[PDB]
Amino acid sequence: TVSNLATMATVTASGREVSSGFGPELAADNQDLPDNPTDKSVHNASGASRWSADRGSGPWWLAYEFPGEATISSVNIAWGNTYATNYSIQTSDDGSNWTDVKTGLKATAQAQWVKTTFDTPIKTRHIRMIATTKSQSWSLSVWEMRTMGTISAVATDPLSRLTPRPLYAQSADGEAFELKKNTCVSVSDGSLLPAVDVMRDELGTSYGLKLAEGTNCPITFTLDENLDVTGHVGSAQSITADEAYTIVSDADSVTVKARSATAGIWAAQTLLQLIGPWTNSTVKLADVAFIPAVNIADAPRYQWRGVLVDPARSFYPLDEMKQMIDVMSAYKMNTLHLHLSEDEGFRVEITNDGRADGDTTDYTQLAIKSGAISYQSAWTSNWSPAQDGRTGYWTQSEFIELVAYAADHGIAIVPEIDGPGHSFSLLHGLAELNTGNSNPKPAAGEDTPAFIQSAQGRSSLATDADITYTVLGHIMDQLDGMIDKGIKASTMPASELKRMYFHLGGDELFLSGGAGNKTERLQEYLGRSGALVKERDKTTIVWNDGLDAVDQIPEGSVVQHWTGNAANNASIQKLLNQRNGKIIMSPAGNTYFPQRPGTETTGVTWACGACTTSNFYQWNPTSSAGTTEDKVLGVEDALWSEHLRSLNDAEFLMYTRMMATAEVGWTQQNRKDYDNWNKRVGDIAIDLMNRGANFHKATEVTSWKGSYAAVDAAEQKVTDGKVLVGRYAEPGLTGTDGLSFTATYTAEGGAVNLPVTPDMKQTYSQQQLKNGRLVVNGAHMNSIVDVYVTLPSDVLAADSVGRLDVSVSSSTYHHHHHH
Ligand SMILES: CC(=O)N[C@@H]1[C@@H](O)[C@H](O)[C@@H](COS(=O)(=O)O)O[C@@H]1O
Ligand SMILES: CC(=O)N[C@@H]1[C@@H](O)[C@H](O)[C@@H](COS(=O)(=O)O)O[C@H]1O
Ligand SMILES: [Ca+2]
């Protein structure tokens, strides 16, 4: 049973002919046409039951906001004496962003019903008719827009933005908490100050909040090592309780409980998602920030939620690593796996401080010599950039700073020094490692092997030589010392942030050829190296193609799975079932960022053809591992850098797929829904535009949206009458001509027109090729649009008193703002 829901709708329109009658609400009054509806005395009787639109060039639109989710079967429009010769019907969840549901619609006569049927009824809070052309110069005329269906009186979900989707989240009673400039925060413990710092780092700029630590503040964080959310853990669910938090908020208070300092940062990240996708605004906004009234209880499914970054192929400066850490933290990733060494580079300084007794190795050569090499474009015959990998390395100071910044965002460092293959940078850097069964050998009269194409994929450390293990042990000791110093600088607890794991690699030894004995080499090397990790009170990690040494690595070692089917891999099952091992899941087709994210893009094709947000989301790491939940540590994305030369190009591949892995890492298997995640991507993107982070504008994402935010003009420079009053963020804009801006000013008493200048520094571009090779930074997002107005002299010269109105319209967006 359907009804005309027009009669319960809140009705808006592009405009109206006259202020006094023919209002848009007269399309929504469920009245049959009067007798003789085309007669002018009937169509133009002052009380005629019809909308008469604004004039001008259009488009002209009529929008219904339902008090609930409407399930709409059909729209039947009774057109008046001026009818739409071309129109569409669009839907909106938010009332501002519109999506086509029926296009190519036409009326063909006066006083004509045009019925548009949805064979599958559509569920929507908003619907509108938008018309581009009409039958006469007169105002478009609508007697009736009947929207036939049923309605469910469900309120908007103030928690709909959250990613990852929490364990438990429900709206609470009453108004939102309004954040004020001097709103203070109380913590139970100093280790929670980093969580408040994360909030202040965004909100200080975007909303001018001090968020000072105070006493008896209305926002509190409490560390409770016994926090229990198991009430919300169902028999088919599984959590890591150490990262549990709760939030309980109302109009007067925001109360956070955290099981760990790390969980306090997760709580802060949740609060920043609730405040909305403008918290990283580089400019003070005019709107106040609100935390809606909520009850949240949250913890992750998996304890290990990571990103591998490979600076070894192409270096990433410290400031770029910080921008990665910011977004990793924003999605509750807790692990930064650094692939520090490769055939093509070594990216951290190792000193001669604290060497073992008898060790006179000169470690300073390693960064000096092997920092200076990188992936060679000339050794590629493909679409890889013409530019070689970036060279360089983090100094110990910068590496300690990297550790501290990661820790202050809830992220631990997991170092990898790959061997015995993928190790040419070590041989190239340290004369002393060129001994025993190492490969390749230095040319006659040389103390280190030449960085030439024939070395690549043919490297082996000397698995038979004591110096190999001396060197590895020193590098482990140096990394540990730097990690300890960075955690100390962060103030986060070492018990939380010092990840007692070391990644030995073990992958693809002699992939391109080399000296043979592949298996006997893995077994000797990973046996002795594993013993180094164990004696340092750590758990060994190896890639799955190093489990040739499953029996020689320590009991309880971890496999990082990337290649083939883990569930059928005998050596993985042996580790997990016979050697109390655990698994980190990085199957290439679900987690490898170089795998091209769309069929329109240029990139690696082998794992999926294109591994999209669907491939990154729609998998279950435990069933992919073919093991039990208890044996799965979690997941890591991989950013391999053979082809990456910039943070912009890395972020193209990382985002938004990384936010799918974040949900796989955190969200319960039975709470995952790819369509629900997909709907959340639009605001994920508005926040990335505010951060200045790049992202692939994937075709399978269907929530790309615009968002208008008013700017606090009091903090903006006026130049020759021109001042920034608004920003408009929409991924994919190639220019501003699709957008119509209008602004008016009213001093109390007075509305005058302000001419608007929209200004977008950069346009959207997909990847660019030159001579068959990707151009570095070819794919880049458009800028947020700056919305300037030019003030008249009387307004320019007035003191501080008035109301600014700004309206933005496109075929897919409409918003009117006032302050
Ligand atoms: C205020 C008022 O009466 N305005 C009406 C309009 O709404 C109408 O669209 C127009 C043409 O009417 S038609 O019947 O010839 O198309 O005539 C009058 O201008
Ligand atoms: C463990 C591991 O992945 N080892 C190697 C990495 O040295 C390589 O860099 C990466 C490329 O990823 S791809 O570009 O997505 O194929 O894949 C594997 O070849
Ligand atoms: Ca009517």
XYZ file of N, CA, C and O in Angstrom, residues 200-270:
284
model
N 43.823 18.623 19.316
C 44.221 20.042 19.262
C 44.955 20.339 17.946
O 44.707 21.404 17.387
N 45.795 19.406 17.473
C 46.564 19.545 16.199
C 45.596 19.850 15.045
O 45.936 20.675 14.207
N 44.398 19.262 15.006
C 43.393 19.595 13.970
C 42.582 20.806 14.398
O 42.376 21.722 13.554
N 41.974 20.730 15.584
C 40.853 21.622 15.934
C 41.357 23.033 16.258
O 40.546 23.975 16.174
N 42.618 23.176 16.647
C 43.181 24.505 16.936
C 43.119 25.400 15.722
O 42.712 26.564 15.863
N 43.409 24.841 14.534
C 43.395 25.597 13.268
C 41.969 25.708 12.733
O 41.597 26.783 12.317
N 41.257 24.598 12.588
C 39.928 24.573 11.927
C 38.860 25.317 12.746
O 37.952 25.883 12.113
N 38.863 25.216 14.072
C 37.785 25.806 14.902
C 38.349 26.720 16.004
O 37.557 27.209 16.831
N 39.665 26.936 16.035
C 40.288 27.883 16.975
C 40.196 27.381 18.401
O 40.152 28.213 19.323
N 40.198 26.066 18.602
C 40.057 25.491 19.958
C 41.433 25.397 20.604
O 42.388 24.898 19.973
N 41.523 25.857 21.847
C 42.743 25.687 22.665
C 42.838 24.238 23.149
O 43.983 23.755 23.273
N 41.704 23.626 23.516
C 41.653 22.281 24.131
C 42.809 22.126 25.121
O 43.543 21.151 25.019
N 42.968 23.065 26.051
C 44.031 22.992 27.081
C 43.707 21.864 28.080
O 42.514 21.648 28.363
N 44.724 21.109 28.517
C 44.598 20.233 29.702
C 44.129 21.127 30.842
O 44.738 22.175 31.023
N 43.061 20.745 31.544
C 42.571 21.443 32.748
C 42.142 20.437 33.802
O 42.404 19.204 33.640
N 41.521 20.941 34.857
C 40.991 20.146 35.993
C 39.470 20.240 35.929
O 38.986 21.341 35.616
N 38.763 19.129 36.121
C 37.278 19.063 36.212
C 36.660 19.563 34.909
O 35.567 20.113 34.940
N 37.269 19.221 33.778
C 36.815 19.674 32.450
C 35.594 18.877 32.001
O 35.340 17.781 32.483
N 34.782 19.405 31.064
C 33.590 18.706 30.586
C 33.901 17.554 29.615
O 33.025 16.762 29.318
N 35.129 17.537 29.102
C 35.663 16.417 28.291
C 36.738 15.768 29.137
O 37.641 16.491 29.559
N 36.594 14.479 29.401
C 37.542 13.682 30.189
C 37.955 12.432 29.407
O 37.100 11.825 28.731
N 39.218 12.082 29.555
C 39.810 10.786 29.151
C 40.315 10.093 30.407
O 41.170 10.670 31.100
N 39.883 8.857 30.594
C 40.271 8.033 31.748
C 40.884 6.727 31.268
O 40.200 5.991 30.524
N 42.097 6.462 31.717
C 42.799 5.196 31.436
C 42.226 4.166 32.414
O 42.291 4.428 33.604
N 41.654 3.067 31.930
C 41.112 2.005 32.811
C 41.563 0.673 32.223
O 40.918 0.205 31.308
N 42.608 0.095 32.792
C 43.257 -1.141 32.292
C 42.297 -2.323 32.347
O 42.603 -3.337 31.698
N 41.174 -2.171 33.051
C 40.134 -3.228 33.188
C 38.870 -2.875 32.419
O 37.872 -3.579 32.584
N 38.910 -1.864 31.554
C 37.703 -1.518 30.769
C 37.176 -2.795 30.114
O 37.930 -3.501 29.426
N 35.892 -3.046 30.284
C 35.241 -4.276 29.794
C 34.179 -3.871 28.778
O 33.180 -3.274 29.174
N 34.371 -4.196 27.503
C 33.295 -3.989 26.491
C 32.744 -5.347 26.049
O 32.036 -5.379 25.044
N 33.004 -6.442 26.783
C 32.635 -7.815 26.310
C 31.102 -7.966 26.280
O 30.632 -8.827 25.543
N 30.354 -7.089 26.950
C 28.896 -6.989 26.817
C 28.486 -6.852 25.369
O 27.433 -7.351 24.999
N 29.316 -6.206 24.549
C 28.997 -5.887 23.137
C 29.687 -6.869 22.198
O 29.576 -6.696 20.971
N 30.374 -7.873 22.750
C 31.039 -8.906 21.932
C 30.131 -10.128 21.879
O 30.024 -10.771 22.914
N 29.550 -10.408 20.711
C 28.609 -11.523 20.480
C 29.385 -12.793 20.267
O 30.609 -12.707 20.143
N 28.713 -13.946 20.277
C 29.405 -15.259 20.240
C 30.174 -15.423 18.917
O 31.169 -16.124 18.945
N 29.771 -14.753 17.823
C 30.473 -14.794 16.513
C 31.463 -13.615 16.376
O 31.968 -13.381 15.269
N 31.771 -12.913 17.449
C 32.703 -11.757 17.358
C 33.931 -12.038 18.207
O 33.889 -12.935 19.049
N 34.979 -11.251 17.977
C 36.329 -11.429 18.548
C 36.971 -10.041 18.631
O 36.909 -9.289 17.599
N 37.484 -9.660 19.800
C 38.254 -8.389 19.922
C 39.621 -8.597 20.566
O 39.836 -9.595 21.278
N 40.496 -7.630 20.307
C 41.709 -7.305 21.091
C 41.358 -6.213 22.096
O 41.306 -5.068 21.695
N 41.138 -6.557 23.372
C 40.581 -5.655 24.407
C 41.583 -4.534 24.736
O 41.179 -3.485 25.221
N 42.870 -4.725 24.463
C 43.896 -3.740 24.896
C 43.651 -2.392 24.204
O 44.094 -1.394 24.747
N 42.973 -2.385 23.041
C 42.741 -1.144 22.254
C 41.281 -0.730 22.381
O 40.818 0.067 21.565
N 40.567 -1.265 23.384
C 39.167 -0.898 23.678
C 39.038 0.534 24.221
O 39.849 0.985 25.034
N 37.946 1.188 23.855
C 37.545 2.488 24.429
C 36.016 2.573 24.416
O 35.321 1.861 23.667
N 35.503 3.457 25.266
C 34.083 3.832 25.244
C 33.998 5.340 25.178
O 34.859 6.040 25.702
N 32.926 5.806 24.582
C 32.549 7.225 24.624
C 31.088 7.296 25.021
O 30.261 6.649 24.361
N 30.818 8.192 25.965
C 29.441 8.553 26.402
C 29.415 10.079 26.432
O 30.185 10.680 27.205
N 28.606 10.683 25.573
C 28.500 12.152 25.433
C 27.049 12.586 25.498
O 26.178 11.811 25.087
N 26.869 13.821 25.945
C 25.577 14.547 25.957
C 25.890 16.037 25.776
O 27.081 16.388 25.564
N 24.895 16.916 25.888
C 25.105 18.364 25.671
C 26.108 18.943 26.668
O 26.637 20.038 26.382
N 26.391 18.286 27.800
C 27.219 18.920 28.863
C 28.582 18.264 29.001
O 29.438 18.858 29.703
N 28.768 17.067 28.437
C 29.959 16.271 28.791
C 30.310 15.304 27.661
O 29.413 14.839 26.927
N 31.599 14.998 27.590
C 32.167 13.936 26.722
C 33.110 13.140 27.608
O 34.110 13.699 28.068
N 32.730 11.897 27.866
C 33.448 10.984 28.774
C 34.025 9.809 27.969
O 33.253 8.987 27.485
N 35.352 9.746 27.912
C 36.136 8.667 27.252
C 36.772 7.800 28.320
O 37.399 8.336 29.272
N 36.619 6.504 28.153
C 37.427 5.514 28.885
C 38.274 4.764 27.853
O 37.742 4.416 26.770
N 39.536 4.524 28.186
C 40.502 3.869 27.281
C 41.183 2.748 28.048
O 41.659 2.996 29.166
N 41.328 1.583 27.440
C 42.058 0.474 28.103
C 43.559 0.705 28.035
O 44.263 0.104 28.833
N 44.022 1.541 27.099
C 45.463 1.820 26.871
C 45.608 3.276 26.430
O 44.572 3.906 26.074
N 46.816 3.809 26.451
C 47.097 5.142 25.897
C 46.750 5.102 24.404
O 46.166 6.082 23.896
N 47.068 3.997 23.741
C 46.785 3.825 22.283
C 45.266 3.961 22.076
O 44.839 4.751 21.225
N 44.455 3.257 22.868
C 42.985 3.318 22.736
C 42.506 4.762 22.956
O 41.458 5.113 22.373
N 43.171 5.580 23.785
C 42.789 7.009 23.924
C 42.932 7.764 22.600
O 42.043 8.573 22.247
N 43.979 7.458 21.843
C 44.157 8.053 20.480
C 43.031 7.573 19.565
O 42.515 8.378 18.835
N 42.639 6.305 19.639
C 41.546 5.775 18.809
C 40.276 6.550 19.160
O 39.586 6.937 18.253
N 39.996 6.738 20.455
C 38.836 7.531 20.903
C 38.882 8.944 20.315
O 37.843 9.435 19.795
N 40.015 9.620 20.406
C 40.217 10.954 19.808
C 39.925 10.902 18.296
O 39.267 11.827 17.817
N 40.430 9.886 17.584
C 40.179 9.748 16.119
C 38.672 9.581 15.870
O 38.147 10.256 14.960
N 37.989 8.761 16.673
C 36.507 8.639 16.567
C 35.868 10.010 16.792
O 34.988 10.355 16.002
